[PDB]
Design a protein around this ligand. Structure first.
Ligand SMILES: O[C@]1(c2ccc(-c3ccccc3)cc2)CN2CCC1CC2
Length: 284
């Protein structure tokens, strides 16, 4: 292994550790593309996990400064302040591909603001959060997953990212509540007569299920609109993106099967991921 191979292998480790779903699908990309995905994904994870290193913004600021150095001087040698392996890999990618730097900065800004989290008043605020933490990730991946990007390409990738974040929220209601976070909006909770603390204590009820299903219907519609526009992506990436999206959306059925439990994290087992691969592979 070369030094740079070592950097990418580490990025792969971070991706596979965090998400078996996205690693299962994106590891099927041609080598140069999967490596680029690993690096971008790893940067986004490090940003997501940054505050708890010390308990403050120090590491996040270092990551931002590193990315800024890459943007301004992609062909110069940098003494990176954050995680050198990840930044070396990102810089390698940036030397070869268009990186939407402002999308990283939007992600970083969203993570900083999350320090001062208060519940979202409206769904518009929740969806703004989904953009910041996940639509941004779609935007940064866009040039890796398409041959000739247009506004449409970014729009579809951004929509997919946001759909996936809403699925993540729908899987994690219980664990998020334990961590003093509720992502359903105050308006929708009031409309549906749902109190998450009360449901965590007492179990689901029809009010909670109707609320959960309200958001699930949004994620599902967005998913279908993405599939309908899958041809924005490169021929090689199309079945891979369909696989990633389908593996993730299968989580919704897993929640339903587990009676919407707030007390464990449901999952799509590897064998079911493979079943989805076969169903897609046969279609392509
Ligand atoms: O990191 C996320 C992600 C967001 C977006 C894409 C994407 C993949 C391909 C095309 C467009 C978007 C992948 C992963 C954001 N969030 C929910 C799911 C995972 C984990 C936390």
């Amino acid at each position: 292994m070369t030094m740079m191979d070592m950097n990418f292998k580490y990025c792969h480790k971070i991706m596979k550790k965090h998400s078996k779903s996205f690693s299962y699908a994106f590891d099927l990309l041609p080598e140069d593309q999967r490596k680029a995905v690993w690096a971008i994904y790893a940067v986004c994870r490090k940003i997501d996990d940054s505050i708890d290193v010390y308990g403050d913004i120090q590491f996040l600021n270092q990551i931002k400064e590193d990315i800024q150095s890459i943007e301004k001087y992609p062909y110069e040698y940098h003494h990176f302040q954050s995680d050198r392996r990840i930044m070396m890999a990102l810089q390698h990618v940036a030397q070869h591909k268009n990186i939407a730097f402002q999308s990283f900065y939007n992600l970083i800004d969203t993570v900083y603001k999350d320090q001062h989290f208060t519940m979202f008043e409206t769904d518009a605020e929740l969806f703004g959060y989904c953009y910041g933490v996940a639509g941004t990730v779609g935007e940064v991946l866009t040039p890796i997953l398409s041959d000739h990007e247009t506004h449409q390409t970014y729009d579809v990738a951004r929509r997919l990212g946001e759909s996936l974040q809403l699925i993540n929220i729908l899987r994690d209601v219980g664990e998020d509540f334990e961590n003093e976070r509720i992502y359903f909006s105050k308006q929708r909770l009031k409309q549906y007569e749902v109190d998450i603390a009360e449901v965590y204590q007492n179990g689901v009820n029809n009010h909670y299920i109707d609320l959960w299903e309200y958001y699930a219907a949004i994620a599902e519609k967005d998913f279908r609109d993405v599939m309908d526009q899958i041809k924005v992506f490169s021929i090689e990436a199309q079945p891979i993106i369909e696989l990633a999206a389908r593996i993730y959306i299968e989580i919704l059925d897993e929640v339903r099967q587990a009676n919407y439990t707030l007390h464990e994290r449901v999952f799509v087992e590897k064998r079911k991921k493979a079943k989805l691969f076969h169903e897609i592979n046969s279609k392509y």
